[PDB]
Amino acid sequence: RALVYGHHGDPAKVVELKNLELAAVRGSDVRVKMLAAPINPSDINMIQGNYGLLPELPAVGGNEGVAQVVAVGSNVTGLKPGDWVIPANAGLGTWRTEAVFSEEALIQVPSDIPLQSAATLQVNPCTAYRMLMDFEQLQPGDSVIQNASNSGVGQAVIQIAAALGLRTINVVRDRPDIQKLSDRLKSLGAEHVITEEELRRPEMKNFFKDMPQPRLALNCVGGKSSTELLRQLARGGTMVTYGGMAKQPVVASVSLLIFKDLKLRGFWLSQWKKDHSPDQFKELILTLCDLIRRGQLTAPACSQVPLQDYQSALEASMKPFISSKQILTMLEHHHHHH
Amino acid sequence: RALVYGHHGDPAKVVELKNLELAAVRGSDVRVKMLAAPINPSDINMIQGNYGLLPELPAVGGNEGVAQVVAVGSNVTGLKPGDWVIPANAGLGTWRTEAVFSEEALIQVPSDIPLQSAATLQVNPCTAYRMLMDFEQLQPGDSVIQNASNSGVGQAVIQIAAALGLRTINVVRDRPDIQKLSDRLKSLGAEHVITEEELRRPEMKNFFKDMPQPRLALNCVGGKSSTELLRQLARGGTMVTYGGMAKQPVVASVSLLIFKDLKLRGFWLSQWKKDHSPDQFKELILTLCDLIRRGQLTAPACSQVPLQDYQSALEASMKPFISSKQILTMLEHHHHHH
Ligand SMILES: [Cl-]
Ligand SMILES: [Cl-]
Ligand SMILES: [Cl-]
Ligand SMILES: [Cl-]
Ligand SMILES: [Cl-]
C-alpha cells in the first residue's frame, strides 16, 4: 500500500492509494517497514511541481519518516533487523507501508527516542539546529528572532536555542487566543512572543530594552513580514529563509542592505546532507537524540492519521493557517484511530 | 559662496546659494580651494532626509569632490599647498568654493590625473573596485552581471572588470538608441549588453552559452529587475546592492534563496572607509590612479555646470531616467560656461 501520484498538481486530487509488490533484496539492499512519515511542504511542492527536485512519475510521495529494518541483504552488516532508519536522500518515497532500499539510501537513528520525534527529525530539529549553527557565531546570551514560531521548526528553534543559552524573540500570527499560545511557547523556553502586528510598529526595534539586538533572524513568511524581521537585526546580521510561498518573495529595503550591512541567505537541509558525510549527519542526529533524552527537546502536538485516511490529512496540512502537523501513521497504537 | 539647506526636503526648493566667512587655520587645519564636486544620490538623500547620516543644519550640501590645498596650519606637514585632496569622511560639505578642514578630514590624491576623475573617484571607481573584490573571489575568466550599467558606477565596473580579465554581462534600460549605447559600453570593455526586457525572458539564463554563470551580480535597481538579476547567478552566488530607491525594495524569491543558496548583501563605501585605515584607502586610490595612467580607466561623459547654476544641475540629476552626471565646477575652463 502506497500514496502515489501519476502527474503534478493539487495533492488532494493528484495523490491516490495504490498497491505495489516488493522488490528483491540484493546484497546491498535493506527491506523496511514504515512506522511514520510527516506531510511536509517539500512533499506538497514535489506533488505540486515547483520544488528543487522531482522524481520519475509515477512516483511515491513523501520524503521523510522513520522505518524499522525488517530484512537485510547478503553483504550489508552495518544495519541489523530491528534498527530504526531515516532516508539519507530526498525523493525515496516514504508514504508507503514497506519498501526495498540500498543501505546507502538509509541512515540508522536510535530506536529509544519517541516515534513521532524520529519521524520529524529532519524537517524540524535538524533544520532548526543547522540554522542556529551555520550562519552566525552565537554564544550564550545572544538573541535570535524568528517568525512562524508556532510551527514545527519554530518550536525546535525555541527548544534548541534555549539549550544553547540563547534568548529568543518569537513572532507569531495574530489570533484570538494569543495568550495561551504565548504561555506554551514560553514554557518551551521562549523569552518573548510577539505578533506580526506588534512587529510592524516602529516602536518595536527597541521595545525589549533588557536584551541585545539579534544577529540572526529566521524567516518562513516573506513579504512585508520578512522586511520587518530584517529591521530587528543588529548591524551585520543575517536573515536565513528556510520556507515560504512562491507568490510571497522575501523583500529587503535598499537602506537595510546598505546602511545596516545585512545578509540574506537560504537554508536547505537536503543540500547540507549532500555536502556532508554520513558521519557528519550521524553526528547531528546523535546530538539531537541526546537533547531528546536530556529532556531538552520534545516534539510538538501532531495529529496522527492512518495511511488510509490520507485525504483528510492532505487537505488539513494545506490550510493557509496551518494548524497541527499531520503525521501519516502506518502502525496501530494503544488508542485505535478510525 | 556655498550651497546650503536650512531643513530637509526636495533639493530644488530646499538648497540655496549663501555666503559665509572662512575660519581660522589651527595647527591641525587645512584651508582648501574646491575645484569640482559631483551631485550624488547620497547628497540628494542627505537633503531629502532619508540617508544613513545627516549633519547639523544649517549645513552645506555635497559629500564628495576634489580640492587644492592653498594654506596650511602651524603643525601639519603631511599636506603641502598645491596638493589635491578628497574628503576622508562624509558630511564635510563640498558644494562650496573654499573651506577650512582638519588634516584628518582630508586625504591627498595625486594631482596628475584628470580633474573630473579626481572629483568622482569615490562614488564611481572606488565603489566599483571594492564591490569586485570584497564579496566573491574572482579570477580572470569569471563573469560578473550588473544592472544600470550606463551609470557612473556601471561604467567603472565595466573598465575595472576588464582590467581584471573578467567578463561582464551589462543590463541597461530599454531605449530608442540601444545600439549606440551598446557599442560604447563594449568599447569600454563590456562583453555583452542586454536590456531589462531581455533579462526578464526565461530563455535568458543560458542565452550566452560561451561564458560561465556569474557568481557576482551588482544591483542598483531593485524590484522585479533585481529578482531577474538574482536569477542569473550561479549556485552560491552573491548579489550586492549599492543603490536604489525607498519604494523599490530588493525582491528575492524563496526558491532562489533556498535551492540556489544565493546571498544578498549591501555595500557602503562610507562604512568601508570607517572600518579601514587611511593607508588602506590611500592604497585603493593609488591602484585607481595607476589604472587611470595605464589608460585602463577613464571617467564617463559628465556635464560641467558652475556653482551659480546649481538649480539647473540639481533638477537634471533628479531625472527618473538619469542622463549625464552633473559635476558642479568651481573653476573656469578653456571654454567658458555661462
Ligand atoms: Cl508569523
Ligand atoms: Cl512576551
Ligand atoms: Cl538597468
Ligand atoms: Cl551583446
Ligand atoms: Cl554572506
Residue numbers in the entry:
A (entry chain A), B (entry chain A): 44 to 381
Task: Show me the paper's own sentences about this structure.
Mitochondrial fatty acid synthesis (mtFAS) is essential for respiratory function. These enzymes are members of the medium-chain dehydrogenase / reductase (MDR) superfamily, catalyzing the NADPH-dependent reduction of 2E-enoyl thioesters into acyl thioesters. The structure of MECR shows a bent cavity of sufficient dimensions to accommodate acyl substrates with carbon chain lengths from C4 to C1619.
Our in vitro and in vivo analyses indicate that the MECR G165Q variant allows synthesis of octanoyl groups but not long chain fatty acids, confirming the validity of our computational approach to engineer substrate length specificity. The structure of the Q165 side chain is well defined by the electron density map. The mutation site locates in the domain interface in between the α helix αD of the catalytic domain and α helix αA of the cofactor binding domain. The side chain points across the acyl tail binding tunnel, making a good hydrogen bond between NE2(Q165) and O(P130). Furthermore, in wild-type MECR, the side chain of K316 is hydrogen bonded to the backbone oxygen of G165, but in the MECR G165Q variant, the lysine side chain is hydrogen bonded with the side chain of Q165 and the backbone oxygen of P130. The introduction of the glutamine side chain to the position 165 neither affected the overall structure, nor the conformation of the catalytic tyrosine (Y94) or the NADPH binding site, but together with conformational changes of an acidic (E107) and basic (K316) amino acid, the modification induces a change of the acyl binding cavity of the mutated protein. Clearly, the G165Q mutation blocks the acyl tail binding tunnel, in good agreement with the changed substrate specificity.
